[PDB]
Amino acid sequence: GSFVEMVDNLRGKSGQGYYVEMTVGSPPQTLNILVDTGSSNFAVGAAPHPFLHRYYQRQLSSTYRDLRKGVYVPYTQGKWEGELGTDLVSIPHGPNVTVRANIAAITESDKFFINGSNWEGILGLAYAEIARPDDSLEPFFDSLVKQTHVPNLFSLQLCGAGFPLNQSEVLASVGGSMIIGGIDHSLYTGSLWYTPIRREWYYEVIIVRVEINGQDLKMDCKEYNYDKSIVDSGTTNLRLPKKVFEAAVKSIKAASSTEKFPDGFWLGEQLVCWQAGTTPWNIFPVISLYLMGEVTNQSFRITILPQQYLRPVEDVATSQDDCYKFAISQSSTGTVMGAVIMEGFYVVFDRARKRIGFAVSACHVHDEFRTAAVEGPFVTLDMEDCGYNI
Amino acid sequence: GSFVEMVDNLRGKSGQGYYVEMTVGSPPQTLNILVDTGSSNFAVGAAPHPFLHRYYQRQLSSTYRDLRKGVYVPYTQGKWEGELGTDLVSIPHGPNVTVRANIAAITESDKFFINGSNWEGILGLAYAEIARPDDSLEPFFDSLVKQTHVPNLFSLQLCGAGFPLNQSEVLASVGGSMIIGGIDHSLYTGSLWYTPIRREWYYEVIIVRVEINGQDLKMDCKEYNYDKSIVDSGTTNLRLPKKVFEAAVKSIKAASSTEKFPDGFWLGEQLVCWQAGTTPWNIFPVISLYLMGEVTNQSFRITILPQQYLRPVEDVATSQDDCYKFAISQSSTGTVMGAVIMEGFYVVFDRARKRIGFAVSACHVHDEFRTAAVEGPFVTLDMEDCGYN
Numbered sequence A: 001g002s003f004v005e006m007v008d009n010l011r012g013k014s015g016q017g018y019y020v021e022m023t024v025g026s027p028p029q030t031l032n033i034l035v036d037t038g039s040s041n042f043a044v045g046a047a048p049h050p051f052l053h054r055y056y057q058r059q060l061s062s063t064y065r066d067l068r069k070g071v072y073v074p075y076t077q078g079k080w081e082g083e084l085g086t087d088l089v090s091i092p093h094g095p096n097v098t099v100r101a102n103i104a105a106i107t108e109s110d111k112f113f114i115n116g117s118n119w120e121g122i123l124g125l126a127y128a129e130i131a132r133p134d135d136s137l138e139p140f141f142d143s144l145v146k147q148t149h150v151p152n153l154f155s156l157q158l159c160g161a162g163f164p165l166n167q168s169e170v171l172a173s174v175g176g177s178m179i180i181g182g183i184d185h186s187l188y189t190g191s192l193w194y195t196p197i198r199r200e201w202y203y204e205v206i207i208v209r210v211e212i213n214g215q216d217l218k219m220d221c222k223e224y225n226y227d228k229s230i231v232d233s234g235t236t237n238l239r240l241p242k243k244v245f246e247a248a249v250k251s252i253k254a255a256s257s258t259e260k261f262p263d264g265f266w267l268g269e270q271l272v273c274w275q276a277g278t279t280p281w282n283i284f285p286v287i288s289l290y291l292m293g294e295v296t297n298q299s300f301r302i303t304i305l306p307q308q309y310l311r312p313v314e315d316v317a318t319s320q321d322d323c324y325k326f327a328i329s330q331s332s333t334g335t336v337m338g339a340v341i342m343e344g345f346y347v348v349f350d351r352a353r354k355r356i357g358f359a360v361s362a363c364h365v366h367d368e369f370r371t372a373a374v375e376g377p378f379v380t381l382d383m384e385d386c387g388y389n390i
Numbered sequence B: 001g002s003f004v005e006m007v008d009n010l011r012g013k014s015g016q017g018y019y020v021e022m023t024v025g026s027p028p029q030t031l032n033i034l035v036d037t038g039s040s041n042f043a044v045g046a047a048p049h050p051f052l053h054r055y056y057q058r059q060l061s062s063t064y065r066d067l068r069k070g071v072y073v074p075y076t077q078g079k080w081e082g083e084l085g086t087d088l089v090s091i092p093h094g095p096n097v098t099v100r101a102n103i104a105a106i107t108e109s110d111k112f113f114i115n116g117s118n119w120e121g122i123l124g125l126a127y128a129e130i131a132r133p134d135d136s137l138e139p140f141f142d143s144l145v146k147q148t149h150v151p152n153l154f155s156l157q158l159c160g161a162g163f164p165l166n167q168s169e170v171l172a173s174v175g176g177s178m179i180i181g182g183i184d185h186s187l188y189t190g191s192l193w194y195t196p197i198r199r200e201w202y203y204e205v206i207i208v209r210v211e212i213n214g215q216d217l218k219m220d221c222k223e224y225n226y227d228k229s230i231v232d233s234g235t236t237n238l239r240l241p242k243k244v245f246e247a248a249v250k251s252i253k254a255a256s257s258t259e260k261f262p263d264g265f266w267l268g269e270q271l272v273c274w275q276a277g278t279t280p281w282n283i284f285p286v287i288s289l290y291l292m293g294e295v296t297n298q299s300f301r302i303t304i305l306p307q308q309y310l311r312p313v314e315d316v317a318t319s320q321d322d323c324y325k326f327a328i329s330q331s332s333t334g335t336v337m338g339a340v341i342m343e344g345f346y347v348v349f350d351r352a353r354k355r356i357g358f359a360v361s362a363c364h365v366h367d368e369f370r371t372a373a374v375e376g377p378f379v380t381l382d383m384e385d386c387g388y389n
């Protein structure tokens, strides 16, 4: 590990998002910011809200600059509207630099902030193409790289605990690491395999094959990326295109058929519980996603365990049972490799070389019989045809 | 002799299938159903789908009965997942009867429904042996015959237009006729010749000889029926076993050599166009399929024209050119006499006498020089050897 100052600088969990501490303004105002590779706007609460115990106060910052322009950003989930401006920003547990970046001061929001999440803003790490209102609003990471000598690359190690974390616990627990400008070798085991970033807007990738316990889902690979596949820390679940979701669920059900679970479970709505320590991990299948490699006709795969796709939750009776929710759901906007998937790996967003790396995470949850994996190479043809075109 | 209430009750085209109107439930829910002699399950969309503008709503039918069982049916083309049940079914332009039949309520599907086809379900008319999940699930036609006095027989007259039919046109045009329980003499000319239904699962038949412009393809006749030969309205093209397909294409290319076409054409993937009205039908050969007759050592033949095996399609430029696709393709599951072949004839599915009849269709496309034909008899020996085991 060569970036000890940034190791363990994240907190949170898959269900409420992982955040990093930042400061904005002069004097610096400390705020917790959700790490989101699924959007491109840096925005912070700038007015009172029931779920916020603090927010950005522009009138108290001598370096605040008003851009005299409003902005409205609706996400799948919720939305917010705010006022654009710029100010000096820093990351206490990050590179030792300060940069002037665009900041959307959130004045109104609907279903955006999460009660008890402990974060007050969002850091969109994706590209300018999807920044609102348009690509002229330079994203934070672009500002960071342009104004400093920090390498154009960041890596994320999201650490799920493997069990429920109450309010106090989630506040004291280390949730992972965000290495700004590099790769810390202590955060993973095995080798790093890279898949190309198909296009620079979302961190889009191309999945070329899918297996459930080694069994090929056998769908036209184009289906896996319809209408796109992205790596998104700003989303809890692994979301899959309708048809892929239906096929996957059918296969996962078949593999775990020794136990019958209610429809609400597979819909990702209701939890299932087992007596403390008896979760039958072994009856659930591993899931392998093959991704396009950097070399022609070459692919590699990442394999996740049920310890990744079954999200730990507290029982409604807060009993001593171990409960979870099925963390895979359908999408109508392409595949979304959310936080529960990222929790099994150390993910390297290599913007400089337009590629994303994957390696088994040193903090992924597993059992004595199975482990997550990143293996290769495999001979795969016509992978370009797996990519979708509107 | 004539069934005016059923004449012209079909709509559609070879490329998207021919369908008949049906009603399910109480009160009646009208749906357009694909006529398919190549499968044995009656199934209808029962949940929203981008290609459907209507579907079966079980909660609105007082006569709906839940069988509490799912059913999964994968076809060559696509597939659907459904829930089994029964309900009262009728055919507005068919026999004046109501039947309680098995219905698979399609809840999920992959490449099954066709955008713009106008049908929302499928009517598998083949036998129980190939019904899913197993042969205990009585096919619609079996229920029909068992619950009513309708004769155990139906006949199909699929009418290809000979040219492309746009969206509005195909919706207003008469696609043909499905006569349930009888034979309408106005739908064909000449005599009806019958070939035996080898076995009751698919409507399986035995081809004993193949000719391209009179020239014998000269293959072991067992190759023509490997691993089976069926009459399937649920498939567009004439599909032939790999080895037969390769020999047939070579012969058809040789016969039409005065003009060269790209490989994509012979692969049935790309169209070929000619200035309006100039399609060189005459350079293309007729295709004759000899079928086993009902009399020992006797056979008859049905002759198809390029007007049948070249499927009319609209040019990408919507120009005034007359374009087509080669409607003959390779198969790995035996010969499939699809819609384009059926369009040249009136086909009688005589279940009661376990045989299929063919007669020149009153609506087949042709030109002033050639016509489709059904002629016989011919002396053919060891025809049983042509069947695959």
Ligand SMILES: CCCN(CCC)C(=O)c1cc(C)cc(C(=O)N[C@@H](Cc2cc(F)cc(F)c2)[C@H](O)[C@H]2CN(S(=O)(=O)c3ccccc3)CCN2)c1
Pocket: A014, A015, A016, A017, A034, A036, A037, A038, A039, A040, A073, A074, A075, A076, A077, A078, A079, A111, A112, A113, A114, A130, A131, A232, A233, A234, A235, A236, A237
């Ligand atoms: C239920 C509470 C939220 N959580 C748990 C905590 C993480 C989810 O699991 C969850 C679930 C669903 C169905 C959607 C989202 C979502 O929208 N995430 C966005 C970030 C986010 C996090 C949050 F905490 C609350 C929010 F309001 C939003 C992410 O940037 C998407 C957004 N889109 S875009 O097309 O809208 C889009 C928006 C803006 C620009 C470009 C595209 C693309 C993929 N990247 C999040």
Ligand SMILES: CCCN(CCC)C(=O)c1cc(C)cc(C(=O)N[C@@H](Cc2cc(F)cc(F)c2)[C@H](O)[C@H]2CN(S(=O)(=O)c3ccccc3)CCN2)c1
Pocket: B014, B015, B016, B017, B036, B037, B038, B039, B040, B073, B074, B075, B076, B077, B078, B079, B111, B112, B113, B114, B130, B131, B232, B233, B234, B235, B236, B237, B333
């Ligand atoms: C490209 C769109 C479809 N069209 C144009 C519209 C007609 C085709 O030209 C076409 C092309 C090919 C290569 C196959 C089929 C096909 O599977 N047809 C089945 C009906 C069908 C129609 C449709 F509209 C969409 C579909 F999903 C399916 C038919 O029941 C077969 C099925 N099999 S079985 O072995 O699977 C089989 C299935 C079930 C039980 C037993 C065997 C045997 C021969 N009878 C259709």
